[PDB]
């Protein structure tokens, strides 16, 4: 139909995050059979192949930002590919990798629909700046490049010339924040970004939280929704095989729930599954739980609802 029409983009890129090993992100999610587990319900699945990530050998660092140009080239390439698959009328399933790719994943999505919304389900806001981080790791600076209210204040870090900030600060909702460094929360409070952290998640209940999140984004006007989803935003009892595990995340139930509310609007238009890392599970059973979690999250995004999915013929026959 309109929804569950999928363009898969595997993006094995790592150089935004330091723990090398997330480049077996799309490989493990595909060998866990995400394609065929879509194909039971009416999923128009078209794999577009993995993106080539060239290696700039002299990707010389910035002041704090390190590996900048590889990240910027990867996200520009992904912005072109996301714009391609959104001109294909599909829902962009862009899975990596790391949050560095979400720059172009939101950018190329805005190249077709400039008035979308971002549900950034993550343990962290990932809105550090190149100037006021202390890491310089670009797996936590995608959102700072994308907000128009931050323009004139973001440095011209190389690789990011193509970057146009494309989303508004009132057009993004964080859900499941649980570890924020101080620069990101000043940005969070000064821009007036609406957010439901694990405080507000527990306060309203996850259902009233998704109710008010859809009342904030879609309560004004129907518009495309871009669920960009980290897998450390869930609790590390379910996904310990991630890059930055922080205890106290969402239960696996509620992660599936957030995806199902985004489905039952019928307005899912872009999906990111980042920070999957099979190299950091202490046992392969940890990796198995993590990858089965992220697969079933992606299933419940496109309408593998826990209520049921059907084909409209009589089955008493």
């Amino acid at each position: 139909a309109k929804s569950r029409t999928i363009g898969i983009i595997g993006a094995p890129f790592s150089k935004g995050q330091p723990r090398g090993g997330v480049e077996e992100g799309p490989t493990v999610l595909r060998k866990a059979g995400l394609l065929e587990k879509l194909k039971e319900q009416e999923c128009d699945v078209k794999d577009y192949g993995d993106l080539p990530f060239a290696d700039i050998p002299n990707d010389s660092p910035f002041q704090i930002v390190k590996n900048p140009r590889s990240v910027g080239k990867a996200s520009e390439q992904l912005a072109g590919k996301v714009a391609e698959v959104k001109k294909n009328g599909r829902i962009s399933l862009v899975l990596g990798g790391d949050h560095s790719l979400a720059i172009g994943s939101i950018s190329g999505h805005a190249r077709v629909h400039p008035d979308l919304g971002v549900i950034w389900v993550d343990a962290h806001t990932d809105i550090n700046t190149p100037l006021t981080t202390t890491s310089g790791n670009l797996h936590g600076q995608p959102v700072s490049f994308l907000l128009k209210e931050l323009k004139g204040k973001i440095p011209d870090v190389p690789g990011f010339s193509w970057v146009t900030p494309c989303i508004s600060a009132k057009d993004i909702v964080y859900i499941g924040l649980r570890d924020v460094d101080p620069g990101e929360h000043y940005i969070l409070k000064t821009l007036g970004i609406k957010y439901f952290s694990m405080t507000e998640v527990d306060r309203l209940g996850i259902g009233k939280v998704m109710e008010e999140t859809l009342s904030y984004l879609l309560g004004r006007k129907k518009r495309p929704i871009h669920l960009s989803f980290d897998v450390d935003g869930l609790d590390p009892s379910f996904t310990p095989a991630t890059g930055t595990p922080v205890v106290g995340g969402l239960t696996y139930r509620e992660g599936l729930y957030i995806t199902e509310e985004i489905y039952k609007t019928g307005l899912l238009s872009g999906l990111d599954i980042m920070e999957v890392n099979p190299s950091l599970g202490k046992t392969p059973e940890e990796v198995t739980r993590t990858v089965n979690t992220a697969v079933a999250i992606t299933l419940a995004c496109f309408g593998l609802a826990r209520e049921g999915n059907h084909k409209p013929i009589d089955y008493l026959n």
């Binding site: 330091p18 723990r19 090398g20 090993g21 290696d55 050998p57 190299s279 950091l280």
Partner: protein
């Protein structure tokens, strides 16, 4: 378990020119590894931090390169304080393996070993043991095999070889052929032999003694 292979196993270069070393990966570590300075019995201090860029208390001459499979450690201004077992070490894959060993010796003119062979004492024979050890001394390079014989018929399971580092001043090497027997096995035989073999030794250096000769 990516195996990191150091292509120069040993190294012996004079105080002088470049001492470019090699370390290879079984995968793409991709500019994510380091270089170390393990002096004997010391702290294996960092030389080069991320395949380049020379960390924080490094003197002048420790450039290196890589990115991303077979890396380089250049010691351009050799500086003879730097004679240490060097290690590359990959980092960005678990588990985090190491190189093999890059013993940077001193290059000098090949020294010949001074070799002779030594009995058990009567003070030992009152204790009841036999320890016939040959003593090898002031040679270069390291490699000597020493054979023993029971009056002409070879020996093991007592025989132990143990080497020091290279000397500070004359820059030479070391071995005892540490062999232990029993007092009974001592008294049954006389002509105890030590057969050295060094590169400087064109003939294998045999030094011997009879029991009750010395």
């Amino acid at each position: 378990e990516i195996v990191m292979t150091q292509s120069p196993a040993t190294l012996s270069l004079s105080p002088g020119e470049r001492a470019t070393l090699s370390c290879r990966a079984s995968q793409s570590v991709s500019s994510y590894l380091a270089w170390y300075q393990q002096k004997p019995g010391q702290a294996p201090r960092l030389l080069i931090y991320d395949a380049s860029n020379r960390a924080t208390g490094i003197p002048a001459r420790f450039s290196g390169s890589g990115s991303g499979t077979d890396f380089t450690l250049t010691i351009s201004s050799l500086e003879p304080e730097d004679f240490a077992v060097y290690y590359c070490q990959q980092h960005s894959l678990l588990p985090r393996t190491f190189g093999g060993g890059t013993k940077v010796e001193i290059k000098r003119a090949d020294a010949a070993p001074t070799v002779s062979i030594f009995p058990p004492s009567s003070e030992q024979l009152t204790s009841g043991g036999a320890s016939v050890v040959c003593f090898l001394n002031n040679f270069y390079p390291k490699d000597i095999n020493v054979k023993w014989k029971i009056d002409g018929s070879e020996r093991q399971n007592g025989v132990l070889n143990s080497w020091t580092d290279q000397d500070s001043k004359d820059s030479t090497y070391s071995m005892s052929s540490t062999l232990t027997l029993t007092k009974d096995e001592y008294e049954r035989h006389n002509s105890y032999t030590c057969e050295a073999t060094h590169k400087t030794s064109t003939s294998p250096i045999v030094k011997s003694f009879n029991r009750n000769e010395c």
